[PDB]
Design a protein around this nucleic acid. Structure first.
Ligand SMILES: Nc1c(C(=O)NCc2ccc(F)cc2F)c(=O)n(O)c2ncc(CCCCCO)cc12
Ligand SMILES: Nc1c(C(=O)NCc2ccc(F)cc2F)c(=O)n(O)c2ncc(CCCCCO)cc12
Ligand SMILES: [Mg+2]
Ligand SMILES: [Mg+2]
Ligand SMILES: [Mg+2]
Ligand SMILES: [Mg+2]
Ligand SMILES: [Zn+2]
Ligand SMILES: [Zn+2]
Lengths: 183, 367, 367, 183
DNA sequence: TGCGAAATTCCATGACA
DNA sequence: ATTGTCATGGAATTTCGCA
DNA sequence: TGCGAAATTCCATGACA
DNA sequence: ATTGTCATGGAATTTCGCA
């Protein structure tokens, strides 16, 4: 078979609802399957409309051959199918209640959930401004399997913001106290 | 008197050739020259004569001398004429230059993507969804371009757009012109917090931002074609134009900005498939070979009458927005340092140090 | 199908070289070329392919072909590419030219004073005594210049000024640009009553009025110098500037406009006295010798990539005041007559006959 | 002596008062002594002020060495003397009650008086607009003594408006009837 | 029939909205 | 049916003053 | 080892307020 | 303390297909 390349397959999924941050409630996660590179777009709802608006931004930079998702309503709609057909994007769905992507992507989506949770606590309504630095951290994180970061695999260079101080990603015991107070 | 007294009786004075007879008439020393009889004024009158002739129409060297020579003759007239031209403040600040600038530099292309960004604003444009301007961000190495519509060329709209862009990567340097949005302290604060060095063009010289300026031409040219026979609704076309230009081949490079940034085409029409059997690591190895071997132009030949700046030289900076019937040039200033053959530091007309392009300077005439 | 069917079995078709093996795969005719495997589309699909590739970013010849060549190959691809470029209306009216105009003509200097006047307006200027504009009238032969301050660049103010001027002499021809004051029927009526032929420049081409335009530069340059460090009260200076410039030497001619018009200096500073012993008739005889022998420049060398108009050629006129995001060129039109190497008559985009300068034309690309 | 040249001597004099024509009452006559070339400037009064305004127009074209006039008040004032001194113009006056200029100038001033009178009658308040064509006629009139017109002697060329139809300059008997009616 | 300096001519440059 | 122009000051060339 | 045609490269031109 | 750029289409040059 042909070797795996960037833009061969984007994996998309929604995270939310979250505490409101400048009127936004959800986060559309897009992960490149080969490089692990991640894009994050905040939306007001997990709808076909908000998905198309966010992906119209991303697809003005690069168009994937395949978009993979679960059977969420926003992705199985015929509006989203017409949108993907106009751009030559093949849609690909996992079986209901059996979400399968890939080991590299599974662990990346795991990192995003825990990294959001760790920075949510203490400032739960201010995550909209932090999404840029979250992406930089995720995309300049050393891969155990491959030798390189997502940034290196996508652009073929070192980055001007390396994250050598690999944060623990676990919740400190004081963050459990303030997290157990709210929700 | 004293110098001209010895001349009438027949002694030799240096500068006054001997073969002509110098006589007296109407109480004035005269001389019979091939053009006719001319008056030789005393030394103490000549500065005033040269000044009276020049001030008639503030004429240059030959036009001023042709006036004087109608009545007068004396040794080395043009030296006294040129001495006055160098002291006439009005002629120095009003007259145009007749020496061209030295040939342009072709700065080395940035080695890597995100080493240097070039940013600039297009606008104002016809209103589209309440938007009037476009922020254009061009990577120096690849030419890859990001477009952002704004309602004003403001610092606030620049920060909002670049925060979305720097989600992808942080650049080392951002180059801009000295427009209000990029020179504010708010923008410098935003750049220092992110480790971004701000680099500014010399004032009133958009050549220096030529990479993004040339991209502005392509953006407007494509928007024009897409809007032929339609109302100018350009807001919805910016994503199309951005994608179209980033995947357009440069005939001299044989590559698209997308290919130089990623080393592989995405799912766009007519995508190149030459590296289909290589691994990504083999692909990125070929990409580093392609980036280093790109064509790069060299300095063109100098024009036959160009000037290049020397330390200590008297030069004049061009007035930026000169009013009606006002001089086009500032008063003479001195070249402190020559940063390169096309860029210098001068001791400003106010007293400050100022970094200027040679295209906005003329060398002061008559030393 | 038919053409490509014989190719698969192994027959020779003109245009398809023999040394390459043409096979079938995925229901498509392919070929193994040094760059890689390419699809050979049927003849009926190629126009659509060239169009899809061009319309991505409305790219030119090489940039469009580089897209197509990623997937396809067929004989003489660039011919089909160029055929589409010549049919794409948006590219024809939006793209810039890359051929320069032919070298400028240097029309013969008018033989006599008052044979041809050149007139034009300067302004608006800073208000001075309620006046905003200046009517500049230049004699073609001598360069002698008359200045008149007006409150608007109107036909009424032009007639009032020229009635005062024509007290001295009536000119044969008055040359002007196509400004509103000179193109009105009121002004043509004023000229026909006096036997004056009105001559107009081709539209949007002030080179054609270059004699008065160049004098406008000298007028403003002297006014600027006289007003340094003063409020811009230029109304009282016009008589001074007029007299100063009319008595200023042209270094290449060795004469002042006053001398070329009158043959003798009046009571001005540094008046020339070479003809003091000649009679007036001897003086006017020398004046006719001086007028005929004045220096006259010649056409410069053509630049290495210039074009000159041919009858029947497709050309496009430049849009005068093009709006934002609108094309810079009109639709193609045909050259009816070549008046001179720099001036032509064309069959306008509306249907009219129009006389234009070659500088406001580009030759339509791809024939 | 040196031969006579243009701009050597202007002869100036006032004609008026006349019937009002667009608010003007007088005419300043300026005649070049050598060529006979004539300039006509309408003024509101025979004052030093109106003289200086008119001559400021003429002296922006050419400055005479000498200005000759009678002992009229406008010309003998010290304001006019200061004006002439600033421009290097020598002033020259005829003896009172003995106005002497030159034969060429005397006959030219005679032509101007009679040519104005002939065109005044019938349209006495419309002479301001006729001054241009009056100057053209006077300056393209054949000289009996010299071979040439004033225009030819000043510019050294033929004129684009020659006046071959030499008008009679006398008053027809019907113009005497309408002239004897008014003033 | 030749030299050094002065005088003259040459001409690229830029600006007339 | 119309068309570039010319002041400017260094550089290049010619002329001058003297022998 | 050489020809005619096609393909490729060259590069002056002009416009980014 | 900073610096011109590059798409475009005829023309010039090189390469191709065949012998
Ligand atoms: N005038 C500006 C131009 C412009 O003229 N472009 C045309 C142009 C001309 C020539 C060339 F080679 C390229 C080229 F693009 C421009 O592009 N930008 O972005 C500006 N941005 C801001 C300000 C206002 C002054 C800011 C402080 C400047 O020191 C002016 C400009
Ligand atoms: N634009 C005008 C210029 C001008 O741009 N001058 C600068 C200039 C540029 C280049 C060059 F070689 C010489 C030169 F002087 C001008 O001088 N005049 O007088 C105008 N008079 C009127 C109209 C409005 C259009 C009228 C109909 C035109 O067909 C414009 C102009
Ligand atoms: Mg700018
Ligand atoms: Mg710009
Ligand atoms: Mg005009
Ligand atoms: Mg003009
Ligand atoms: Zn001056
Ligand atoms: Zn097109």
């Amino acid at each position: 078979d042909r070797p795996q390349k960037p833009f061969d397959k984007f994996f998309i999924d929604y995270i939310g609802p979250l505490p409101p941050s400048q009127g936004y409630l959800y986060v559309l996660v897009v992960v490149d399957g080969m490089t692990g590179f991640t894009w994050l777009y905040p939306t007001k709802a997990p709808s076909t409309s908000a998905t198309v608006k966010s992906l119209n931004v991303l697809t003005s930079i690069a168009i994937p051959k395949v978009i993979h998702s679960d059977q969420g309503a926003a992705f199985t709609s015929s509006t989203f199918a017409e949108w993907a057909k106009e751009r030559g994007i093949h849609l690909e769905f996992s079986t209901p209640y059996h979400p399968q992507s890939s080991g590299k992507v599974e662990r990346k989506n795991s990192d995003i959930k825990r990294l959001l949770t760790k920075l949510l606590v203490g400032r739960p309504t201010k995550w909209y401004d932090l999404l840029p630095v979250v992406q930089l951290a995720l995309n300049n994180t050393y891969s155990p399997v491959l030798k390189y970061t997502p940034h290196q695999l996508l652009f073929g260079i070192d980055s001007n913001t390396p994250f050598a101080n690999q944060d623990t990603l676990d919740l400190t015991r004081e963050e459990e106290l303030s997290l157990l107070q709210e929700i | 008197d004293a110098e001209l007294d010895q001349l009438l009786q027949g002694h030799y004075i240096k500068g006054y050739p001997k073969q002509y007879t110098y006589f007296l008439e109407d109480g004035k020393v005269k001389v019979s020259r091939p053009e006719g009889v001319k008056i030789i004024p005393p030394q103490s009158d000549r500065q005033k004569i040269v000044l009276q002739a020049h001030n008639l129409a503030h004429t240059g060297r030959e036009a001023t001398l042709l006036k004087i020579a109608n009545l007068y003759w004396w040794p080395n007239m043009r030296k006294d004429v040129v001495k006055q031209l160098g002291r006439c403040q009005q002629c120095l600040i009003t007259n145009a230059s007749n020496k061209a600038s030295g040939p342009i530099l072709r700065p080395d292309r940035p080695q890597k993507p995100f080493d240097k960004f070039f940013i600039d604003y297009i606008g104002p444009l016809p209103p589209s969804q309440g938007y009037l301007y476009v922020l254009v961000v061009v990577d120096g190495m690849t030419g890859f371009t990001w477009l952002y519509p704004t309602k004003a060329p403001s610092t606030s709209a620049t920060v909002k757009s670049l925060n979305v862009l720097t989600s992808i990567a942080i650049p080392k340097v951002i180059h801009s012109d000295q427009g209000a949005a990029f020179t504010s302290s708010t923008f410098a604060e935003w750049a220092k917090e992110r480790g971004i060095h701000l680099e500014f063009s010399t004032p009133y010289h958009p050549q220096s931002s030529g990479k993004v300026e040339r991209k502005n031409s392509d953006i407007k040219r494509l928007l024009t074609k897409l809007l032929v026979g339609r109302p100018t609704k350009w807001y919805d076309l910016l994503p199309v134009v951005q994608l179209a230009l980033n995947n357009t081949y440069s005939p001299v490079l044989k590559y698209t900005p997308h290919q130089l940034l990623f080393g592989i085409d995405s799912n766009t029409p007519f995508a190149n498939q030459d590296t289909l059997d290589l691994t990504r690591e083999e692909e990125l190895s070929l990409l580093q070979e392609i980036r280093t071997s790109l064509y790069h132009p060299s300095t063109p030949p100098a024009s036959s009458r160009s000037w290049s700046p020397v330390v200590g030289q008297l030069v004049q900076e061009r007035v930026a927005r000169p009013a009606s019937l006002r001089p086009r040039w500032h008063k003479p200033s001195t070249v402190l340092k020559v940063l390169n053959p096309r860029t210098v530091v001068i001791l400003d007309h106010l007293g400050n140090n100022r970094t200027v392009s040679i295209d906005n300077l003329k060398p002061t005439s008559h030393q």
